[PDB]
Amino acid sequence: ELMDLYLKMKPVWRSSCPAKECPESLCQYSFNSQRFAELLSTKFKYRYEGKITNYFHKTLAHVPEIIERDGSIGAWASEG
Amino acid sequence: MSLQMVTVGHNIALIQPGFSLMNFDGQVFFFGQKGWPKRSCPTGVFHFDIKQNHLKLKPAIFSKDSCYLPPLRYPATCSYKKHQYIIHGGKTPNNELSDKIYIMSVACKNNKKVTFRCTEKDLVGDVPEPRYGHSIDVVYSRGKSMGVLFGGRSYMPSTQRTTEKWNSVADCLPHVFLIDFEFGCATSYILPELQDGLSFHVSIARNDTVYILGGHSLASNIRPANLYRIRVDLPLGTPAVNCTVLPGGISVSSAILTQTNNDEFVIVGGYQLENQKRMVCSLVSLGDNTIEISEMETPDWTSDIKHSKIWFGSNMGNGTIFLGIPGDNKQAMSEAFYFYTLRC
Amino acid sequence: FEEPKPNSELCCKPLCLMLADESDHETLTAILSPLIAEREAMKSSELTLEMGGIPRTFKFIFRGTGYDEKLVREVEGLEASGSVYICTLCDTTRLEASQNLVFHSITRSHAENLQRYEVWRSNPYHESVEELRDRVKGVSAKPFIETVPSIDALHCDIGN
DNA sequence: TGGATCTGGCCTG
DNA sequence: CAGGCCAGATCCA
Numbered sequence: 001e002l003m004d005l006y007l008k009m010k011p012v013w014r015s016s017c018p019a020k021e022c023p024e025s026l027c028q029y030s031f032n033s034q035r036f037a038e039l040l041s042t043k044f045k046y047r048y049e050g051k052i053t054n055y056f057h058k059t060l061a062h063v064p065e066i067i068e069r070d071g072s073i074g075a076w077a078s079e080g
Numbered sequence: 081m082s083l084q085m086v087t088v089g090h091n092i093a094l095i096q097p098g099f100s101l102m103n104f105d106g107q108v109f110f111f112g113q114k115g116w117p118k119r120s121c122p123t124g125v126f127h128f129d130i131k132q133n134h135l136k137l138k139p140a141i142f143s144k145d146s147c148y149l150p151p152l153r154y155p156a157t158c159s160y161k162k163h164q165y166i167i168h169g170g171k172t173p174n175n176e177l178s179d180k181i182y183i184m185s186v187a188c189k190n191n192k193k194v195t196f197r198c199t200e201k202d203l204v205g206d207v208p209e210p211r212y213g214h215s216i217d218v219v220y221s222r223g224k225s226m227g228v229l230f231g232g233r234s235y236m237p238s239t240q241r242t243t244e245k246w247n248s249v250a251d252c253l254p255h256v257f258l259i260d261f262e263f264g265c266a267t268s269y270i271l272p273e274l275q276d277g278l279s280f281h282v283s284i285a286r287n288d289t290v291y292i293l294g295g296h297s298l299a300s301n302i303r304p305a306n307l308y309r310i311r312v313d314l315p316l317g318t319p320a321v322n323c324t325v326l327p328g329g330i331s332v333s334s335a336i337l338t339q340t341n342n343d344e345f346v347i348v349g350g351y352q353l354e355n356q357k358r359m360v361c362s363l364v365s366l367g368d369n370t371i372e373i374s375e376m377e378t379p380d381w382t383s384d385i386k387h388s389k390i391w392f393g394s395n396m397g398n399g400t401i402f403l404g405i406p407g408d409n410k411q412a413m414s415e416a417f418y419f420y421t422l423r424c
Numbered sequence: 425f426e427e428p429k430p431n432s433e434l435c436c437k438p439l440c441l442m443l444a445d446e447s448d449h450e451t452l453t454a455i456l457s458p459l460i461a462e463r464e465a466m467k468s469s470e471l472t473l474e475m476g477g478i479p480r481t482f483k484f485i486f487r488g489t490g491y492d493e494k495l496v497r498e499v500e501g502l503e504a505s506g507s508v509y510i511c512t513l514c515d516t517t518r519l520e521a522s523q524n525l526v527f528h529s530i531t532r533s534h535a536e537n538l539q540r541y542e543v544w545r546s547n548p549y550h551e552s553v554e555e556l557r558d559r560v561k562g563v564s565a566k567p568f569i570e571t572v573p574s575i576d577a578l579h580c581d582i583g584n
Numbered sequence: 585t586g587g588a589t590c591t592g593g594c595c596t597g
Numbered sequence: 598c599a600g601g602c603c604a605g606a607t608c609c610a
């Protein structure tokens with residue numbers, strides 16, 4: 001279930017146009033993020049009790065706001 | 081005339097050219113690290129200790145009301161005499177110059193525990209422009225203490241600066257400044273005997289005189305063998321500055337000054353030409369109204385010092401200096417700067 | 425216009441190249457100062473250029489996103505990546521990020537970082553190291569490159 | 585017995 | 598595999 005949640009969350013901040021080709025995924029990003037966070041905090045207390053990666057923090061807190069502000073994430077990435 | 085190697089702890093990569101060694105009650109400290117201060121030492125000052133030829137750079141906390149100051153990479157240090165320490169200007173790590181004044185003092189001391197106190201002094205009047213490599217000393221004339229300031233190197237003015245020559249540097253004007261510590265005021269004075277600019281010289285203080293000798297002039301790419309004596313008096317009205325040119329000077333730049341005995345100073349290290357290195361030492365014996373420069377014995381330098389290109393250091397205070405020689409390459413890390421100590 | 429392959433090797437145009445260490449801050453600043461100078465100079469100007477027989481003018485809006493986490497930490501006046509303050513977008517601690525994990529808001533910016541460094545250097549409230557860091561939210565250096573708060577997709581994927 | 589002194593762990597690379 | 602920050606085990610005057 002955790003892997004499925006991550007794979008549902010991924011296509012938003014990796015697509016050049018997350019507002020067009022992944023509308024349902026963009027809309028359900030918040031619900032998937034909350035599910036991911038609660039799953040971590042409940043079932044994985046042996047890894048995420050008092051410490052969590054800043055990249056998980058970003059993916060669970062800041063991605064939708066950046067999408068709304070800019071329009072896309074991944075077109076501005078460092079791949080080029 | 082004794083030369084020894086001093087090792088380093090795990091903070092070798094924290095000493096860069098242009099540091100300053102500041103001494104309080106026989107305890108020497110480090111200033112001017114490389115890179116912005118990390119969490120390991122948020123204050124930025126360091127404890128310099130040589131025991132059995134080994135260096136351990138313990139941090140040093142500040143006072144509650146102190147101001148945390150950026151690493152000055154080429155400042156002007158002064159030893160005021162109720163003991164304080166003066167640093168003014170220099171390069172910050174991001175390579176912009178500062179024109180503000182920091183005052184140092186030891187706030188409190190415990191069993192092998194030291195706390196400093198930093199205050200920021202603002203100057204009003206003819207404020208000297210930001211620069212680096214300049215020299216600051218103090219004079220004591222008729223119950224009044226006040227420090228003299230000279231020119232160094234500074235960037236082009238904000239109206240003649242271009243991006244293609246952003247980092248180009250030109251010597252400051254040879255104006256002699258009189259900055260007052262207890263009032264934060266300055267009066268700019270121009271003296272005819274000083275026509276060409278001077279940078280990275282060595283200056284020596286006495287009762288009511290300062291001896292500036294050596295220095296690099298960037299205008300014509302020469303190092304004059306000059307020697308100027310500046311006399312300051314403090315009447316009721318405005319102070320007066322008189323400069324006299326004396327013969328027998330030396331042609332050095334970015335040399336190291338230290339005190340061996342009372343009315344006794346020695347110049348060690350420096351640069352004679354662009355590709356030439358000052359391999360001799362000069363004993364400058366001061367007095368009441370007379371100066372005499374003679375050559376002392378040449379210390380036995382090792383091959384690493386003799387065949388290097390850059391050395392740098394400061395004054396420990398107790399008849400000792402601390403010069404550095406670059407070591408090996410940089411990719412192999414670990415030991416990158418070879419550090420030596422010299423006994424006078 | 426709209427770039428078809430924004431992440432391809434065919435769209436990025438080299439502008440300044442050097443052989444210097446990333447973390448060697450002194451020479452990094454020495455080399456990159458002119459480019460930031462031109463950036464700030466031209467951020468509020470207008471460019472007139474001849475286009476096929478008709479003159480046309482250009483405005484410019486700059487967005488900095490192509491910096492990895494270590495570069496952002498170094499050039500935005502921030503601490504190391506292993507510090508208590510983790511995110512370069514909000515002022516939250518690692519522990520508090522672990523108890524909440526959901527609700528946040530972006531509040532960091534270049535001007536805010538500059539004024540936080542000014543507060544850190546001036547010490548206008550007469551506080552100790554810990555109190556001053558708690559006041560400045562982890563700012564201990566002067567930033568010199570302006571970037572927008574954004575997430576690097578490649579490194580986010582690698583870390584996850 | 586309360587700060588020094590390592591020391592492995594965690595984070596980005 | 599280098600580099601930095603941090604909570605925890607020694608430890609010594």
Ligand SMILES: [Zn+2]
Pocket residue numbers: 057058061062510511512513514515516528
């Ligand atoms: Zn955050």
